[PDB]
Amino acid sequence: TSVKPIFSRDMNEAKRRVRELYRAWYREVPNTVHLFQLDISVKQGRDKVREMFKKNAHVTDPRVVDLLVIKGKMELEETINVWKQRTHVMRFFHETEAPRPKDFLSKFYVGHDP
Amino acid sequence: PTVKPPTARKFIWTNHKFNLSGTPQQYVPYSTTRKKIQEWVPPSTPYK
Amino acid sequence: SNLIEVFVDGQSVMVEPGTTVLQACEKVGMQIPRFCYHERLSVAGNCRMCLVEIEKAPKVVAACAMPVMKGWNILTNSEKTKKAREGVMEFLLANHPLDCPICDQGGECDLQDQSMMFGSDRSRFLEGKRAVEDKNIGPLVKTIMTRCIQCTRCIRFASEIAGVDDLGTTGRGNDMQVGTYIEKMFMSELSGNIIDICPVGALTSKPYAFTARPWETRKTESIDVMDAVGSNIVVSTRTGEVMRILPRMHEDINEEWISDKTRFAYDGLKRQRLTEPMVRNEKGLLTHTTWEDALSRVAGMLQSCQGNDVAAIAGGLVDAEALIALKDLLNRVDSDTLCTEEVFPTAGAGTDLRSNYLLNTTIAGVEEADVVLLVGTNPRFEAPLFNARIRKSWLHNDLKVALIGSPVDLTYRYDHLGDSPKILQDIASGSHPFSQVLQEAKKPMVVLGSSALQRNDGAAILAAVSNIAQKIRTSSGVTGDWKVMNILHRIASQVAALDLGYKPGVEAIRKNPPKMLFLLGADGGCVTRQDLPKDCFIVYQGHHGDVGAPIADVILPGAAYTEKSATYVNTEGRAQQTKVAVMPPGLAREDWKIIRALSEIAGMTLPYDTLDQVRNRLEEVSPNLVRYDDVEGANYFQQASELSKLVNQQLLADPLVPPQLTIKDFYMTDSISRASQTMAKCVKAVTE
Amino acid sequence: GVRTSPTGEKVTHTGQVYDDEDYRRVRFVGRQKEVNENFAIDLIAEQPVSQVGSRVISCDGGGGALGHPRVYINLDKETKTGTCGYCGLQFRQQH
Amino acid sequence: LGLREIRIHLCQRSPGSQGVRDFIEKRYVELKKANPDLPILIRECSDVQPKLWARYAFGQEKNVSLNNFSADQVTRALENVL
Amino acid sequence: TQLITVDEKLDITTLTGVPEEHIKTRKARIFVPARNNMQSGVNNTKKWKMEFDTRERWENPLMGWASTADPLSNLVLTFSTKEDAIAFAEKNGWSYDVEERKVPKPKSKSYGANFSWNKRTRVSTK
Amino acid sequence: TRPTVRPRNDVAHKQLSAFGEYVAEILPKYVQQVQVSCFSELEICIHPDGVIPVLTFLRDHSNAQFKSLADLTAVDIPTRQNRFEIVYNLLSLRFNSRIRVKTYTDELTPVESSVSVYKAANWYEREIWDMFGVFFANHPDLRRILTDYGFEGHPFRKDFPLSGYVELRYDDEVKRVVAEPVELAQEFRKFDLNSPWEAFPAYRQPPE
């Protein structure tokens, strides 16, 4: 099963590229929140960014992690340019609840949700 | 159209009710459909 | 040896002898445009669309009746084959009216599809087009005989699988009215199957008649209810709702077959359903309210009560998932009593022992039986598809079928033995020539109905039938594994409740009085508020309750079989899950969702929240119920019958008669079929 | 030409009149529910049943190729007058 | 508290399950005569680990695996349950 | 060229941006569509249709339509083998159910069987 | 078939047959199928490692000029281990002929950036990356064109549904445009339309 790679040799170089990407996102926040005339503190946005990094935490193939690094690189280039607008950055946040919980009783009052 | 106007069918108006959006007399949409599922009738008598 | 060569379009293949051209073409992947052939009926070479050119032949032969001789070369797509098909299609579209908008088979015609993909396009026949006066075959089947192309398919249908013989050809030439001369209502069981047999829009549905069109509706997988057989049913649903149902094919059971009550049974499913939970009011009036007040009242009462006062009767069409959830909450609180509407005896360990309480054989495997007797029931009005299978067996190969209890209108020249259990045991045991046919036959089958199960002597009659099966089991060395013995049922949830370890019959409530009980679909009067103390607190969780629901204290709006992913068992032990097609009107949540929410609110919990975890606990309780779509053959019949000698009581000489005996008793025995005015129309039609 | 609700509203030719526990009534407030005044069932019974003393007849419906296609209906039952599925207007034979 | 229900999980081919088939040939009518009050039950699906479970004491379920065991050991496990 | 490759399964739901709610919530169904029995044509076989479960469809209060908040409601995926069907259902992360294909059973018919001498198989009408 | 039937050029049939046999015999390393359609356009079905060599060959070599680039498309076909189809289309100025280079590809293993031999393939590659996800290594600029930047999911897959997961509206609460989950006011009534009965017997695939 000789399958071509993308960039790396195992998950270790993938961890190196994603921690470089996380460093770039971490020092890329304050210019964005200063520029876009936003509404949310710096640490809250940084916490949701690192939460997004925590979200995909069970991926083991090197090609998929490399491709997520490429996706984050594309999105970081677009945010460090002013190509995106206020709507997109607020669209990364989810403030428009929908507070729909996993409570089975609350799943029962508004239901049909297996 | 005074050469031959008419038609010999008895449903055609003679008022010709003109455009009326922004009046107290204007069209509304609704459903031309009767009862959907016919909810259960509870009986009126008591058991004690 | 048993192989004959054909060059279907120059492609060689081996074919079994005796078969014909069309089966070989379906063996190689071809079709042939056909009308009067059908894969469940006799072959009658009438349609003429099925033609095909064989080389070295001046004529063009029909591909239905021609036997496969050695070494053919079949030209399915030759020149004069296509010429003949264009000709015969141009003949068929002369006497057929222009009803393509108003017809009922717009996307589902056969003339239209074959006239595109094989017919001509420019027509002829400037003047003519005869017209035929329609009949009124019955208030369930709309009938316009002008669209009839005289393809002679319903006639063979009736004369074989219905046996009724009310539809015949009248006339000659162009004038051949196909129908009944005497204007009699063609009414029997499986009469609903004739509107799908009719390959054109001539014999069609009456309640569906001008309500939909096939391309808008979407198909949905489902499993039949109201019968212990479970024909495979596809619901043509439309717009969060329905339109109608259709049968579809399982190999073991119900190949292109459905009950007529089943076919026309969706009206009462949509007629007067329950919508919201309902709580009584101190005026005495069952008002409706939100889930909060109702579930709080139920949870407070259930937490404030224990003992042997917790009863649950589950009858009619209920899940297995809801039964698992109710049983689990039931054993969370303290203890048990659970009953169904119907009664099964527990003497020779009948609740366990997979042998006795279901149909042991294969329903397709009854074709290989030789001598069958039938102790009290009526299979024409208890799972009529099984009766159609019996008649199909008797028509193809040899049978000898006797009936014990009442001479009914089974339509296939049956033997009748009389009405006493002493007659059946003594005649079939000691000395009788029909009993000699039993002893010196090869593959016999005794079918026990659930109708004679209702009396108190059911343990004794069960013991007698097990004695007959045990005597033939010790006789003749045949065949093991195979068996004379099988029984039938009426409700699938009865079989599921027998599987999950419940008490059949209301006897545990008859002895021990409860003080809190849950009715899951108790239609009939098993228990009332007079066979029970005055402070009842019954909770009816159901749908379109009209008998049983005004009795109730707390109404819960349960779901329906088209509204939840069930897991049902046939009469021979096959787990068939349903698929959700319609979301229910009203609040009306799922049943196991209601029970696990009740466990959430009352002071307990359950270690499962989703239907996959419900399937995990169902896998805990019974392993076969999650392994779908498959048969399960148990053993230990002699062990069951030697367990049966614990209780050996009287076989009273009352003449046992099946109450399943007439047309109204077929049509009205459910809340669903009782509600639908379609069934009321055909009840007053058949009676008056 | 029409009938009227107990609340005092124009009903339609289809029986879709309302409760007193609704809200489509409150979107009908102040704005006229424009029902069709002339119904459809009423015009048919006013028509004279066209009687031809033939056996099997044709129908076009108001001009050749302007209307429903040709339908050939039967007149062999006598108490059951043959109705065109398109026209709606009945026929009787004569003898 | 007391016993409520006993469940048996079997197949057609496994050596311990074959031991349970021998146990259920020889010592089930004896087991049923022992208690006509306990609803023990026997199940097969097509093939499964031949389990023996017992639910009692307000829903507490207990497992024994009767894989690769003989019939007298199954009798011993039945005595362990009852 | 005998490069890096690991031998693991695929978890493409990290790439296709789909909500995890609609991943873990729904459950696919893989089946051969049964023939629409009012017609008689078996060309509608020879496929492997993947659908999803049907879900909530209320009514538009203003018109009487059918509205739904279900984005994966009206898909169908036509496949040609059950092997790659189940492979794809594993590959794109969602759970799945597998029904099984049921063939038309071959039979034994003849016009001569319809016209026997002593056997009760007799059409008696044609 | 003398009226109303489109005639076909059997001269071009034989010429494209001979040319396809020529190319297939002279590059045995990557050529897997050469098929001639009945309506006479050449199709060459290609392993995804001779992308750059075969395109350097087809742009040049002077027996086949083929400067003009048409579409690059990707057609999403499941039930295949290699799903997607990168379809180059080439047109010769001097010769008036069209060849469809159908090279295959999977979900993840890339192909190799035809912009180094074909400048017109640049934005085609950017578009096919944004809409499908066929990765394009050794390429300068892979960004998003024909989507929103807050949008993702590669919506031209068959796996992505018709209506997208997001839906915009305006609200005065946060004084801006927000993106909610999809709430259709009408069903998009899907029509089962594929009738049976085998409209083309020449294209009968064999059974199992």
Ligand code: SF4
């Ligand atoms: S009524 Fe229908 S099935 Fe019967 S002969 Fe006519 S077309 Fe055939």
Ligand code: SF4
């Ligand atoms: S049966 Fe077929 S051909 Fe006849 S009117 Fe109906 S759709 Fe048309």
Ligand code: FES
């Ligand atoms: S099937 Fe051969 S004649 Fe109709």
Ligand SMILES: [Zn+2]
């Ligand atoms: Zn007319």
